[PDB]
Design an enzyme around this catalytic site. Structure first.
Site, PDB file in Angstrom:
ATOM      1  N   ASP B   8       0.882  -1.163   0.000  1.00  0.00           N
ATOM      2  CA  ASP B   8       0.000   0.000   0.000  1.00  0.00           C
ATOM      3  C   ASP B   8       0.935   1.231   0.000  1.00  0.00           C
ATOM      4  OD1 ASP B   8      -2.299   1.637   0.265  1.00  0.00           O
ATOM      5  OD2 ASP B   8      -2.392   1.420   2.459  1.00  0.00           O
ATOM      6  N   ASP B  10      -0.189   4.896   1.413  1.00  0.00           N
ATOM      7  CA  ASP B  10      -0.398   5.583   2.700  1.00  0.00           C
ATOM      8  C   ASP B  10      -0.236   4.643   3.903  1.00  0.00           C
ATOM      9  OD1 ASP B  10      -1.151   8.419   3.600  1.00  0.00           O
ATOM     10  OD2 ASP B  10      -2.740   7.309   4.614  1.00  0.00           O
ATOM     11  N   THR B 109      -2.950   1.236  -4.350  1.00  0.00           N
ATOM     12  CA  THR B 109      -3.364   2.339  -3.491  1.00  0.00           C
ATOM     13  C   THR B 109      -4.714   2.944  -3.815  1.00  0.00           C
ATOM     14  OG1 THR B 109      -2.707   4.592  -2.796  1.00  0.00           O
ATOM     15  CG2 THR B 109      -1.787   3.831  -4.890  1.00  0.00           C
ATOM     16  N   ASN B 110      -5.397   3.436  -2.744  1.00  0.00           N
ATOM     17  CA  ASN B 110      -6.642   4.197  -2.799  1.00  0.00           C
ATOM     18  C   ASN B 110      -6.190   5.626  -2.806  1.00  0.00           C
ATOM     19  OD1 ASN B 110      -8.235   1.838  -2.604  1.00  0.00           O
ATOM     20  ND2 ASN B 110      -9.321   2.546  -0.776  1.00  0.00           N
ATOM     21  N   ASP B 171      -1.846  -1.085   5.948  1.00  0.00           N
ATOM     22  CA  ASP B 171      -1.982  -0.581   7.322  1.00  0.00           C
ATOM     23  C   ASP B 171      -3.451  -0.593   7.819  1.00  0.00           C
ATOM     24  OD1 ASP B 171      -2.436   1.592   5.476  1.00  0.00           O
ATOM     25  OD2 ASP B 171      -2.273   3.017   7.131  1.00  0.00           O
ATOM     26  N   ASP B 321      38.726  12.913 -14.437  1.00  0.00           N
ATOM     27  CA  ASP B 321      39.882  12.545 -15.254  1.00  0.00           C
ATOM     28  C   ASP B 321      40.064  13.547 -16.423  1.00  0.00           C
ATOM     29  OD1 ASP B 321      41.889  10.133 -15.793  1.00  0.00           O
ATOM     30  OD2 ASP B 321      40.862  10.498 -17.700  1.00  0.00           O
ATOM     31  N   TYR B 363      52.538   6.242 -18.688  1.00  0.00           N
ATOM     32  CA  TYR B 363      51.301   5.921 -19.419  1.00  0.00           C
ATOM     33  C   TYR B 363      51.154   6.852 -20.630  1.00  0.00           C
ATOM     34  CZ  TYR B 363      49.433   3.375 -15.232  1.00  0.00           C
ATOM     35  OH  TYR B 363      49.224   2.509 -14.182  1.00  0.00           O
ATOM     36  N   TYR B 442      45.253  12.453 -25.341  1.00  0.00           N
ATOM     37  CA  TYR B 442      46.649  12.541 -24.831  1.00  0.00           C
ATOM     38  C   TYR B 442      47.640  13.042 -25.883  1.00  0.00           C
ATOM     39  CZ  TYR B 442      45.260   9.213 -21.129  1.00  0.00           C
ATOM     40  OH  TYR B 442      44.636   8.616 -20.073  1.00  0.00           O
ATOM     41  N   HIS B 500      41.061   5.439  -8.498  1.00  0.00           N
ATOM     42  CA  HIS B 500      40.920   6.363  -9.628  1.00  0.00           C
ATOM     43  C   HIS B 500      39.496   6.468 -10.198  1.00  0.00           C
ATOM     44  CE1 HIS B 500      41.682   8.522 -13.279  1.00  0.00           C
ATOM     45  NE2 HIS B 500      41.043   7.556 -13.943  1.00  0.00           N
TER      46      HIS B 500
HETATM   47  C1  LIG Z   1      45.635   4.163 -17.791  1.00  0.00           C
HETATM   48  C2  LIG Z   1      45.276   5.585 -17.515  1.00  0.00           C
HETATM   49  C3  LIG Z   1      46.278   6.524 -17.368  1.00  0.00           C
HETATM   50  C4  LIG Z   1      45.950   7.840 -17.108  1.00  0.00           C
HETATM   51  C5  LIG Z   1      44.628   8.249 -17.003  1.00  0.00           C
HETATM   52  N1  LIG Z   1      44.254   9.574 -16.724  1.00  0.00           N
HETATM   53  C6  LIG Z   1      44.953  10.739 -17.087  1.00  0.00           C
HETATM   54  C7  LIG Z   1      44.280  11.943 -17.001  1.00  0.00           C
HETATM   55  C8  LIG Z   1      44.918  13.118 -17.339  1.00  0.00           C
HETATM   56  C9  LIG Z   1      44.092  14.358 -17.189  1.00  0.00           C
HETATM   57  C10 LIG Z   1      46.249  13.063 -17.766  1.00  0.00           C
HETATM   58  C11 LIG Z   1      47.016  14.160 -18.139  1.00  0.00           C
HETATM   59  O1  LIG Z   1      46.503  15.430 -18.113  1.00  0.00           O
HETATM   60  C12 LIG Z   1      48.324  14.055 -18.568  1.00  0.00           C
HETATM   61  C13 LIG Z   1      48.908  12.811 -18.642  1.00  0.00           C
HETATM   62  C14 LIG Z   1      48.170  11.714 -18.263  1.00  0.00           C
HETATM   63  C15 LIG Z   1      46.861  11.811 -17.822  1.00  0.00           C
HETATM   64  N2  LIG Z   1      46.234  10.681 -17.472  1.00  0.00           N
HETATM   65  C16 LIG Z   1      43.628   7.307 -17.142  1.00  0.00           C
HETATM   66  C17 LIG Z   1      43.954   5.988 -17.402  1.00  0.00           C
HETATM   67  F1  LIG Z   1      42.951   5.096 -17.531  1.00  0.00           F
END
Ligand SMILES: Cc1ccc(Nc2cc(C)c3c(O)cccc3n2)cc1F
Ligand SMILES: Cc1ccc(Nc2cc(C)c3c(O)cccc3n2)cc1F
Lengths: 523, 523
Positions: B8, B10, B109-110, B171, B321, B363, B442, B500
């Site tokens: 219900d 209310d 419900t009513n 109720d 990110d 990276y 990147y 992250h």
């Molecule tokens: C594997 C991996 C590495 C880095 C990021 N994130 C970032 C984010 C920014 C904003 C970055 C950046 O501004 C410069 C260099 C690397 C960067 N990596 C996300 C991933 F999944």
């Protein structure tokens, strides 16, 4: 020959000029003449204002530096000056007319990066203006400023034109000077009328005293298109524009979201979030074949689900023709979901419970038999829309004689209400699903009546507007006369010399009526 | 065995009960006991309240009839009672747990057709509740009422279950009575805890004392999907939910609008209009191949056009990110368009003009060479996302060793943060364009640095929030330490034991942080 027109913002496309407020403050506060204008331009190309105009610093960073060159409130003075500055309508109108005639138009302005708490007012101004031009060149974005020669060479480069092909309009002689030295036609803008006379003379296009222009329309490829699955086989498409309270626009038969093309930019500019639907059976929305899929009960239920899925607790519902019928039933069965309701042409007439609905409506009987009307309507789409979409005097239109277009031309003339391009948009939309879905809206008379009889003891008590069109011969104004019996607080609008296709027949007045009613009754 | 649970509204899913306010008003006004409750039920199945509950009349039509049976303000009493009635959280939680375990859930419900000036509050309540159930059966929509036997047979018919498979919670003992006579399991709800103990006992599912549940997520097929062409070859896709100020959510690498799945329903419920983007290069958004199409300048320019085309003068921008990086540049270059700015993990660090950007970021070098990282990342999508999307303790992750997944399993275990279904959503999204577009974000280090150097004299002075994640090893909290030098009024949030992937790692706290900041600083 000229092919580009360039306009300044302050003192040209927007009035009163922000420059002219420094002098007014001096006079109001009885300060020495040109004191505030001097503090403003202090340091020349090395000064705080040049840095602001180039984008090196933001407006909020500049306020303390300006207070310095002055040594009340600079923030307060500028806040009032920016708020007061409005679009110079006749100037915009002239820019609109030149673009329509093939000119490349642009705005070239010395402006700043606005980070003030009240920056939105200006953001709104720039948004309204910019949509009407090919380019917007802002000093703070290009790191260049008038009267520096590079901004002019940059302007020619973006325009892809030589100086002699460019008319340049500015209210500051010094900023006008480099364009002239390059070979451009220049207009010093003091008063608007004289500036436009100069513009009209050099372009050879009438800009002054011109007829009242139609409201801004929609380019389909420039809109945000939205898609909501309301049930497994049913998806609804809509066009969305603006921010503010949700306003859901519901077209009639055999129409499109595009039937609201003149209302969408107007309502969004008035402070509303417009959702212009492709109703079930139309355009990009799903078109199942079954008749029952188009009874009022299912259509209204799906529109509620559409709101559910978008996260909207309410919307104002505005409908025309069959959309007007849907909208009255949304108000009767789902008042909690309807902020306010408005109908164009469609009156609200309660169902007679002692009489079946089949007992100017010969059209509806011809539409009953599945396949008959589809065959005639789908045979030539260009002919169908050209014959249908016509003003009250353009009348090209029984059942019996065996058809809707029996004594109608094979190639009708183009109505004054539409262009060939606009007709072809409807032709393209209708190529996807045809007329089966749209015609099924007429094929549920008994189901709709049975459902309507459940509402016979209710009244419409939420805000409501009824808009009548003098020359609509299907949905005549006289049919709305007893509506007050069921909608006691009903507000009204009426449009003279208006046919059935209200939105495109009389767009300016439709907009005036809706905006006034929305602002008073819908928030 | 039970397979359906019916609740219900209310006194069951919503508290305090609207029925219990009649008794409180009597006691407050020192009126005879049960006077207002008697006027309310006057006439039984022939009375004004039965007509209201069946949908024959609306709430506004009922108020004068109730004032009659009473012979202060009935409207005022009911307005306060409806406003005070809130969702019974533990009851909703138990309904959520049963549905998750395979039960068909429904609300019976009513209720009435609410046409009051303040009907929105209730419309909002029903919207929040209904999304969590298979069915919502309202007396005023079906023209039937509890305790009439037909509504129960209608309930079984909609449920497609026999009475012994249904737990029914109410109720009101009298409304519970017909369900029991049919053979249904029934719980008389007085206090919530005891009702849930009874529910837990009969279902054999733990409902009471259960762990803290995750926020509501998104089903992709149930959302409104929006599409905006920002330039000839570029279209942007977004998911949209809610009404109120526009909140634009910007994901990072290699993500999706779906990365905000736990924030979308929460932010819309808090009173915002959420626009969750597929950033350029991702999902249903366009993915051109050219590197230059992904420099910060072009991305920010396209996001401005996205706002232009939707008719939005501003939006609040929330990024994670690479989306966090975009959002700081929207604040620096377009402050007029940014209502407020928030970043999850990404700090704002001004560019060093005396040093090139290439001089925990190994990276980024591996990502520089076109084709290398695409090859490894696209080889096995299920493996890519399973390896990437992991909590701080689940760590399965240099360049050199020749790869991102050199010493990583071929079939990684499923992180506690995601289901197999959610991983497969990312796999399906990435099948369309791959990693070229995402990796190009990147590949503009030099262009981005050159553009950033134009902003070196500016400060961020619009409302701003920086949210740090303790265990993010790429975007470490310590990197945000000097941000106040450039954003003096900067507000902060911090999330402990958070990796992250902030949104899915700690959804409850992300939502708490964002909503609190939005309500204080963004309107
Ligand atoms: C594997 C991996 C590495 C880095 C990021 N994130 C970032 C984010 C920014 C904003 C970055 C950046 O501004 C410069 C260099 C690397 C960067 N990596 C996300 C991933 F999944
Ligand atoms: C050709 C044509 C005929 C009728 C209508 N519009 C309507 C609208 C409603 C709402 C109707 C209705 O409710 C009953 C019968 C006919 C109706 N015709 C539109 C056309 F393009």
């Amino acid at each position: 020959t000229l092919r580009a027109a360039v306009f300044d913002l302050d003192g040209v496309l927007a009035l009163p000029a922000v420059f002219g407020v420094l002098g007014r403050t001096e006079e109001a506060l009885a300060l020495p003449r040109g004191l505030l204008n001097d503090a403003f331009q202090k340091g020349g190309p090395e000064g705080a204002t040049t840095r602001l105009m180039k984008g090196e610093i933001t407006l909020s960073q500049w306020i303390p530096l300006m207070e310095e060159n002055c040594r009340f409130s600079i923030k307060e003075i500028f806040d009032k000056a920016i708020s007061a500055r409005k679009i110079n309508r006749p100037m915009l109108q002239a820019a609109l007319m030149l673009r329509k005639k093939g000119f490349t138009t642009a705005i070239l302005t010395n402006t700043w990066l606005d980070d003030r708490a009240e920056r939105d007012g200006l953001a709104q101004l720039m948004c309204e203006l910019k949509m009407h031009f090919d380019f917007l060149i802002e000093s703070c974005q290009v790191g260049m400023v008038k009267p520096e020669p590079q901004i002019y060479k940059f302007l020619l480069d973006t325009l892809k034109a030589s100086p002699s092909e460019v008319v340049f309009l500015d209210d500051i002689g010094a900023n006008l000077k480099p364009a002239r030295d390059l070979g451009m036609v220049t207009i010093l803008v003091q008063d608007t009328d004289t500036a436009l006379k100069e513009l009209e003379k050099v372009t050879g296009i009438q800009l002054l005293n011109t007829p009242a222009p139609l409201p801004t329309s929609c380019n389909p490829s420039d809109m945000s298109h939205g898609y909501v699955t309301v049930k497994p086989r049913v998806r609804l498409h809509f066009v969305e524009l603006g921010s503010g309270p949700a306003v859901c626009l519901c077209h009639g038969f055999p129409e499109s979201w595009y039937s609201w093309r003149y209302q969408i930019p107007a309502l969004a500019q008035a402070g509303y979030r417009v959702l212009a639907m492709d109703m079930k059976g139309y355009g990009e929305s799903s078109a199942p074949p079954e008749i029952e899929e188009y009874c009022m009960e299912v259509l209204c239920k799906e529109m509620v689900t559409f709101l559910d899925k978008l996260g909207l607790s309410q919307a104002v519902f505005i409908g025309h023709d069959w959309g007007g019928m849907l909208v009255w039933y949304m108000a009767l069965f789902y008042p909690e979901r309807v902020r306010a309701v408005a109908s164009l042409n469609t009156p609200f007439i309660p169902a007679n419970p002692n009489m079946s609905p089949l007992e100017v409506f010969d059209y509806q009987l011809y539409f009953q038999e599945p396949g008959v009307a589809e065959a005639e309507l789908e045979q030539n789409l260009s002919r169908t829309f050209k014959s249908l979409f016509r003003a009250s005097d353009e009348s090209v239109l029984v059942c019996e004689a065996g058809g809707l277009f029996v004594n109608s031309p094979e190639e009708p003339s183009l109505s004054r209400m539409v262009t060939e391009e606009e007709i072809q948009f409807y032709v393209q939309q209708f190529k996807k699903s045809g007329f089966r879905g749209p015609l099924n809206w007429y094929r549920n008379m008994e189901r709709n009546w049975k459902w309507a009889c459940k509402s016979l003891g209710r009244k419409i008590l939420i805000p409501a507007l009824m808009v009548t069109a003098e020359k609509d011969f299907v949905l005549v104004p006289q049919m709305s006369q007893h509506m007050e019996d069921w909608i006691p607080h009903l507000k009204r609008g009426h449009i003279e010399d208006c046919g059935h296709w209200t939105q495109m027949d009389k767009p300016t007045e439709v907009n005036q009526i809706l905006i006034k009613w929305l602002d008073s009754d819908a928030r």
